[PDB]
Design a protein around this ligand. Structure first.
Ligand SMILES: Nc1nc2c(ncn2[C@@H]2O[C@H](COP(=O)(O)OP(=O)(O)NP(=O)(O)O)[C@@H](O)[C@H]2O)c(=O)[nH]1
Ligand SMILES: [Mg+2]
Ligand SMILES: [Zn+2]
Ligand SMILES: [Zn+2]
Lengths: 126, 166
């Protein structure tokens, strides 16, 4: 099979299909995008104890291998908390009136409870 | 926050990945790239509490059927998906649930039967037939459509509510 096991950040994993001529940076874009990640914010290894690979590496050069994608040095995960906004605030998703909702103190993202799944997956500023 | 190990099972092409990706990214995947194993972690607020859903998107292809016994002992709740425009997928999900109760060795496993692709008008599986199967297992049933996002959050949130008590 033309498959590669790839371990993604935030304790996630996928199994990508490989086409001859296709790149590694392009083969893992979909899996990284649907998880709120960017490849140029990440460095891809190949497990051996890991060997760093360049993002332009041919995806056929590692068929049957197990890779891992990690963050560079110098954030992730939100810390949601119930907050009732006295200062006039609106949601960050639907931009409508928000008085009783939730907010992550780390990111400052404010939203309604029914507006929870449209919050970006990754969180900045730790 | 509370973590929930959700598992999405079902025959091939019923819309498991399209349902999961719709929940976490609000996109609609209209391409069909078959899944082998996909892991998603997304933080969610259900009924006022912060939930981190560790959703396991499984393979519907019969080549990876041996993986069923593996993830059907790890997961806490199972989203058993079929396509309302595909009668073969409705009976395929019948033995998915029966296999879950057997390897869980329980008659009370958090499950949510989900009929997908309800935006389509060429329906061949009545909801009566689906609620018949859902009531026989004592599990809820929720019609969804990964394209129009109808009932997508309802199906995932219902399974979390089933795990929360149990
Ligand atoms: N109209 C419509 N199409 C849908 C819906 N859900 C999925 N599809 C389509 O059906 C096809 C299969 O979707 P997919 O999510 O890959 O199904 P799957 O169960 O994950 N397949 P597999 O088990 O092989 O991984 C895709 O072309 C997708 O766009 C839906 O609700 N409505
Ligand atoms: Mg899939
Ligand atoms: Zn945040
Ligand atoms: Zn909102």
């Amino acid at each position: 099979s033309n498959t590669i096991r790839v371990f993604l950040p935030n304790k996630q994993r996928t199994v990508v299909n490989v086409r001859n001529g296709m790149s590694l940076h392009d083969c893992l874009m979909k899996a990284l995008k649907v998880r709120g990640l960017q490849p140029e914010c990440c460095a891809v290894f190949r497990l051996l104890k890991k060997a760093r690979l360049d993002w332009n590496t041919d995806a056929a050069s590692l068929i049957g291998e197990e890779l891992q994608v990690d963050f560079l040095d110098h954030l992730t995960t939100h810390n949601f908390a119930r907050k009732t906004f006295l200062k006039l605030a609106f949601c960050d998703i639907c931009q409508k009136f928000l008085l009783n909702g939730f907010r992550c103190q780390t990111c400052g993202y404010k939203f309604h409870e029914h507006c929870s799944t449209k919050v970006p997956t990754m969180c900045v500023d730790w | 926050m509370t973590e929930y190990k959700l598992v999405v099972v079902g025959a091939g092409g019923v819309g498991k990945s399209a349902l999961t990706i719709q929940l976490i990214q609000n996109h609609f995947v209209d391409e069909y790239d078959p899944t082998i194993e996909d892991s998603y972690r997304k933080q969610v607020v259900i009924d006022g509490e912060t939930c981190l859903l560790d959703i396991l998107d499984t393979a519907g292809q019969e080549e990876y059927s041996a993986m069923r016994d593996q993830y059907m002992r790890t997961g806490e709740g199972f989203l058993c998906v079929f396509a309302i425009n595909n009668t073969k997928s409705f009976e395929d999900i019948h033995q998915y649930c029966e296999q879950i109760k057997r390897v869980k060795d329980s008659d009370d496993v958090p499950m949510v039967l989900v009929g997908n692709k309800c935006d389509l008008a060429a329906r061949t599986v009545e909801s009566r037939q689906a609620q018949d199967l859902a009531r026989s297992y004592g599990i809820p049933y929720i019609e969804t459509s990964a394209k129009t996002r109808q009932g997508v959050e309802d199906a995932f949130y219902t399974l979390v509510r089933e795990i929360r008590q149990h």
